[PDB]
Amino acid sequence: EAPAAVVTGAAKRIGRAIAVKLHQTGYRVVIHYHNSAEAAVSLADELNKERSNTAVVCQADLTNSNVLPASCEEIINSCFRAFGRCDVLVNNASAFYPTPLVKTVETQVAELIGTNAIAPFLLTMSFAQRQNLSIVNLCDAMVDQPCMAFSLYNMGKHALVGLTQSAALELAPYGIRVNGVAPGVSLLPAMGEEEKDKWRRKVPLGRREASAEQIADAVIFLVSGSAQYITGSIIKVDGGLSLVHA
Amino acid sequence: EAPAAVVTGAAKRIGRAIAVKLHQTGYRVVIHYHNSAEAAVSLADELNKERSNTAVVCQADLTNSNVLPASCEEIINSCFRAFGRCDVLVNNASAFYPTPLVQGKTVETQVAELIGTNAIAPFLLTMSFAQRQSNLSIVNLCDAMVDQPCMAFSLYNMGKHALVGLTQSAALELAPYGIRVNGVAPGVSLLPVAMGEEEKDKWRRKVPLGRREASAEQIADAVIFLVSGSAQYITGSIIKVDGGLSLVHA
Amino acid sequence: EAPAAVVTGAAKRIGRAIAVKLHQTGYRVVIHYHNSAEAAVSLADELNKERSNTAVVCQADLTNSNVLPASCEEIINSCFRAFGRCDVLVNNASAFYPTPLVGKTVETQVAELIGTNAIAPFLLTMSFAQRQNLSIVNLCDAMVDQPCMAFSLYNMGKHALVGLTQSAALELAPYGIRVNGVAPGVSLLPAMGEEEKDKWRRKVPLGRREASAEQIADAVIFLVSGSAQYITGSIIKVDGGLSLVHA
Amino acid sequence: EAPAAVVTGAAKRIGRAIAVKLHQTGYRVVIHYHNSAEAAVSLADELNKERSNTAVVCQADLTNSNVLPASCEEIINSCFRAFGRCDVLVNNASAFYPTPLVGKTVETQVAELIGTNAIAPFLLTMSFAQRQSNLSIVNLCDAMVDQPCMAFSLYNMGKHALVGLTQSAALELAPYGIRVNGVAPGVSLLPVAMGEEEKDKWRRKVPLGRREASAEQIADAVIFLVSGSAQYITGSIIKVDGGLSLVHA
Ligand SMILES: NC(=O)c1ccc[n+]([C@@H]2O[C@H](COP(=O)([O-])OP(=O)(O)OC[C@H]3O[C@@H](n4cnc5c(N)ncnc54)[C@H](OP(=O)(O)O)[C@@H]3O)[C@@H](O)[C@H]2O)c1
Ligand SMILES: NC(=O)c1ccc[n+]([C@@H]2O[C@H](COP(=O)([O-])OP(=O)(O)OC[C@H]3O[C@@H](n4cnc5c(N)ncnc54)[C@H](OP(=O)(O)O)[C@@H]3O)[C@@H](O)[C@H]2O)c1
Ligand SMILES: NC(=O)c1ccc[n+]([C@@H]2O[C@H](COP(=O)([O-])OP(=O)(O)OC[C@H]3O[C@@H](n4cnc5c(N)ncnc54)[C@H](OP(=O)(O)O)[C@@H]3O)[C@@H](O)[C@H]2O)c1
Ligand SMILES: NC(=O)c1ccc[n+]([C@@H]2O[C@H](COP(=O)([O-])OP(=O)(O)OC[C@H]3O[C@@H](n4cnc5c(N)ncnc54)[C@H](OP(=O)(O)O)[C@@H]3O)[C@@H](O)[C@H]2O)c1
Ligand SMILES: Nc1nnc(-c2cnccc2N)s1
Ligand SMILES: Nc1nnc(-c2cnccc2N)s1
Ligand SMILES: Nc1nnc(-c2cnccc2N)s1
Ligand SMILES: Nc1nnc(-c2cnccc2N)s1
């Protein structure tokens, strides 16, 4: 009966909003988490109270390593084990921090390129091997006007655009659509406060950040039957921010 | 009180599906048309049968000329006259035909039609829409293939490129007024009536997702999303609806 | 047997630097101008001092109208008449002023902003090609995806020009005519107060200064040269990294 | 007095053409190579016979691993040790082969296709900058990144990452006077493995002359970007593809 979705990094913020909204649309969900065990379970409790046995949790470090492929295949497996099917993959988990050109660098590589790009590629491979099917990749609207000193992160997000397009092309014959949603500033990451207002003030549309829910709305669209011919598309949800010159 | 939308070139094909779906969502519609008088009238009948007083037609040439600004002002005015408001503008009307660089209309007529309909009229309508002013938005019909154009279609491609610029420029400028501006970019959808049948399968063969063109309804679905409350933070975005066609190398 | 080049809006600033550098490279040049007769003639005289009979001027308004096609045809024609050939077209002339969405009529703004930036380039390109290392270089704009506010028509003209660059490269490649662009960010500034000039210079990562006209010309020279023989449909940003800078 | 450049994968084909052209322009060159030992030395001989002490070779695997940072640091050191300076870095070395989504393990493919095409360029860029006049980096990109070969996701990911590196590094290193740009071939010298018929299929798609670019034509664009005629250009990627990327399916 009901379709099932994997949302990586689903315990908090945008991944949570995505998981909730998919659930409210009648998806069963695998809430993937790495460090946020208590939040992941709490979200699962909340969803299962609403409808029994519709939410499970799955722990995995999505850092690149010789065990990343096994971890990714296990995430896809948990969805089939729990629900008998996997209809939707949302690649939301993301590491984000500066790596100035002027943690070891190879750990930074592992987290920024691994979680942002290599895990999505491995998840994509496993999702496809095990088959309205679609993947949604959480991209970044500021990819071409990147944050200063954030090269590895930026590289990881560009790689994700490449994956989005390559996977859309290759998996289209399987009926698997592949798309993305690119936030501008949503709920800031902990991060600065005078710093956060500086950003909201740049945004043409209402001088504010998205909510997580506004991100989720775009995901919900792309997975829906209203996006059945859309693949290879990346929808910016940034209130115009990427259009604003320096 | 129901919202209202203007859809240009709405008598047939994609514009029609857009009009229908906006109406089904609860909009009152101004059906703009140029030559397709019967179909336009026919569609307004259908819509008004379903909910009386929810559909009018509006005839206008969208070729560029020194009266285009008045025609565009009039198209917007008509929505306000019939419905007391104008919440949504869809720029869908479009001329499309070859203009070879090395080669029965003059080149000034080709410029006026291809650039007027695809870019100048959208700019003038946008300006009238904004001036006359809730979830206000504009959706422009763009082209997923503008960076991999049809050979010998330079004026058309220039017009569609300009429409991308308009989408971004108007998104940026109208945002502080609460008007969002976005686009939907078809690949191949319902193919020209004048086009033969082997040429159609040639093009359908190219589409990775399902080896066919978009239904008009699939295009309309994307319009519906962009005007909806689920797209409130979305402005300056152009959604390709092309089944992966723009991803395919030569 | 020297090649020959048309540069539009060649009398001053960037088109002047382009015509000079093309002339230095061995081109004979048609210096097109609209209002700047004295500077156009003065450039032609300088250039002709350097080498007899290698520069002519050509006056024309590039605003769109029913006479634009004939104007563009005559510009191309003048190069064949003066020099017997036309190897290079540089589409440089450009109007630029705001057209807010919310004292010329709108249709005159359209004529000027879409005419000069896009329609005249298309008409010139058609004339250039009908009359045939042949290439065209269009002056595009590095900031076309992050436009100046209230410049919709200018921005529309420059997007149109990108489409032309691509469409003409595709269509003219069988005839061996390459078509490329050069996209300045901030170059010689629009007169303006040094405080406001400085605001823009401040934004440029590479050296915190605007491009010299010669720096723009350098990229044009490359694209027309034998070193760019396989390059077509390409637009080279010459912007010191300005378009990479977020808001 | 003479400037010096590092060129990766410089033993054959486009990297060779690039090192040859930089050499003809008066650069001293470090010819980096991985397996092409004989070709690398043969090339350095040739160059050194034209002017002596102007070419060294440097062997290194650019696969990602915990020792890639050291190898990249050493490549840059090669150039300072041989020539006392490092003016230009050309990131040319590149692994290229299919990785279908539906021999090598997947982690080896990630390591070779992402390492050579993106991680090594990032590490080399970091060491080039740390060790520091017309300083620049040129990355060999791919004009077809947005219309990719089917079943080449990992290669395509690496080339996209290399576009982000190009932009991120142009931005970050501009204050230090280091420019970062790219050159994007369409089809150039086709793989040695490729059959003639398959080659002509690709040649036929190219609007400008229905042929692939010569290695020299690719090199010309690199030569421009490092030149004083590109002094204000940074963050630009120049397609050298004869119009291939403009052709619809
Ligand atoms: N926030 C914004 O404004 C913004 C802007 C642009 C793009 N985005 C994109 O939108 C998406 C979600 O946004 P967000 O801010 O909600 O994400 P986020 O808070 O930065 O991180 C999302 C989750 O990813 C997981 N994660 C991080 N590193 C991991 C690793 N090594 N292994 C496994 N899991 C890991 C974490 O899960 P655990 O907590 O369970 O460990 C984390 O809570 C991301 O892909 C992001 O790149 C967001
Ligand atoms: N069809 C595709 O595969 C495809 C692909 C890419 C983009 N698009 C875009 O999607 C939109 C709709 O596609 P479509 O195929 O439905 O369009 P279409 O049928 O080619 O044209 C839509 C309408 O535009 C109107 N129009 C044409 N010239 C006009 C003028 N001078 N003044 C006023 N109206 C004029 C016509 O109205 P009358 O019939 O009333 O005279 C026509 O019915 C267009 O913007 C198009 O550029 C379509
Ligand atoms: N300067 C910059 O920072 C910058 C930035 C981005 C792009 N660009 C582009 O680079 C190119 C050259 O830049 P620029 O600053 O030197 O240009 P500009 O000084 O603004 O204009 C160039 C010339 O175009 C001619 N022109 C203007 N309107 C005309 C009309 N209606 N008919 C015929 N000719 C007309 C003028 O000729 P007369 O003087 O003879 O009347 C003018 O001297 C342009 O395409 C521009 O859009 C420049
Ligand atoms: N050829 C084309 O049509 C084309 C098309 C698009 C883009 N490009 C780009 O243009 C550049 C040059 O192309 P090309 O065809 O000359 O390149 P290529 O022959 O495929 O590769 C150049 C060199 O890369 C080195 N390399 C491969 N794997 C390596 C590793 N694990 N560690 C260190 N070095 C390694 C090899 O050096 P050894 O032989 O010494 O082992 C090889 O000779 C590349 O970046 C390519 O991606 C080329
Ligand atoms: N995982 C994240 N990706 N991007 C983030 C972010 C947070 N604040 C500003 C910009 C950002 N990209 S957080
Ligand atoms: N108005 C129109 N714009 N584009 C059209 C079209 C039809 N078939 C293939 C491609 C197209 N752009 S019809
Ligand atoms: N013709 C012109 N096009 N762009 C110009 C310009 C001048 N100052 C700042 C930005 C600009 N685009 S002038
Ligand atoms: N290292 C390489 N990158 N791309 C290559 C290539 C070879 N043939 C066709 C397209 C290609 N990108 S070889």
| DSSP secondary structure of D35-55 | S-HHHHHHHHHHHHHHSTT-E
Q: How far apart are CA A112 and CA A100, in angstroms?
A: 13
Helix (H, G, I), strand (E, B) or coil at D214: coil
Nearest CA in chain A to B248: A169
Contact call for residues C161 and D191 (beta carbons, < 8 A): no
Q: How far apart are CA C42 and CA D16, in angstroms?
A: 47
Overall number of domains in chain B: 1
Burial class from Cβ neighbours inside 10 Å (0-12, 13-18, 19+) for residue C2 reads: middle
> How remote is the CA of residue B97 from the centroid of ligand 1, in Å?
47
Q: What residues of chain C lie within 8 A of the CB of B149, using their CB?
A: 163, 166-167, 170
Name A4's bridge partners. A28
Residue whose token pair is 């040695």: D192
Q: Which-ligand-closest: CA of C190?
A: 7
Q: Do B230 and A236 touch (CB under 8 A)?
A: no
Contact call for residues C54 and C23 (beta carbons, < 8 A): yes
| CB neighbour list of residue A106: distance below 8 Å, 6 or more residues apart | D64, D65, D66, D68, D69
B positions 128-187 inside 8 Å of A (CB): 168, 171-172, 175-176, 178, 180
Which residues does chain C break after (C to N > 2.5 Å)? Answer: 102, 132, 190
Q: Which-ligand-closest: CA of B219?
A: 2
Q: How far apart are CA B20 and CA B43, in angstroms?
A: 8
Q: What residues of chain A lie within 8 A of the CB of B215, using their CB?
A: 229
Q: Do A243 and B236 touch (CB under 8 A)?
A: yes
How is residue B186 written in tokens?
A: 């078809």
CA distances from C134 to B126, C25, C125, C164, D144 (A): 40, 15, 12, 17, 25
CB atoms within 10 A of CB A186: 19
Top residue of A161, A170, A205 to mutate, by most chain B CBs within 10 Å, is A205
Q: How far apart are CA A31 and CA A45, in angstroms?
A: 11
Assign 3-state DSSP to chain D and report helix, strand, coil percentages, each to 5: 50, 15, 40
Select from B230, D122, D71, B242 the least CA-distant residue to A217: B230
Q: What is the CA radius of gyration of chain B?
A: 17
Task: List the catalytic residues of A.
Answer: 140, 153
Residues C8-22 as b/e (b if ≥16 CB within 10 A, e otherwise) read bbbbbbbbbbbbbbb
The answer to whether the annotation marks C172 as part of a ligand binding site is no
What CATH number has the domain bearing residue A242? 3.40.50.720
How is residue C36 written in tokens?
A: 């700047």
List of E strands, B104-209: 136-141, 179-186
Residues B184-199 as b/e (b if ≥16 CB within 10 A, e otherwise) read bbbbbbbeeeeeeeee
Contact call for residues C194 and C242 (beta carbons, < 8 A): no
Q: How far apart are CA D3 and CA C139, in angstroms?
A: 33
Contact call for residues A24 and A55 (beta carbons, < 8 A): no
Q: How far apart are CA B84 and CA B65, in angstroms?
A: 28
How is residue B61 written in tokens?
A: 């040439």
Name the DSSP class of B211.
T
Burial class from Cβ neighbours inside 10 Å (0-12, 13-18, 19+) for residue B202 reads: exposed
Burial class from Cβ neighbours inside 10 Å (0-12, 13-18, 19+) for residue D103 reads: exposed
CA distances from B113 to B105, B143, B153, D210 (A): 10, 17, 13, 34
Contact call for residues A199 and A192 (beta carbons, < 8 A): no
Q: How far apart are CA B71 and CA B112, in angstroms?
A: 14
Q: Do C243 and D232 touch (CB under 8 A)?
A: no
B27 annotated active-site: no
| CB neighbour list of residue C192: distance below 8 Å, 6 or more residues apart | none
The answer to whether the annotation marks A23 as part of a ligand binding site is no
Nearest CA in chain B to C233: B147
How is residue B207 written in tokens?
A: 């589409």
The answer to whether the annotation marks B125 as part of a ligand binding site is no
Select from B154, B155, B91 the least CA-distant residue to B125: B91
Does residue B19 have its Cβ closer than 6 Å to ligand 2? no
CA distances from C120 to A126, B64, B94, C91, D70 (A): 54, 16, 22, 8, 56
CA distances from C14 to A36, C21, C139 (A): 58, 11, 10
Angle between helices C120-130 and B154-174 (to 10 degrees): 160
* Residue A156 belongs to domain spanning: 1-246
How is residue A188 written in tokens?
A: 């800031």
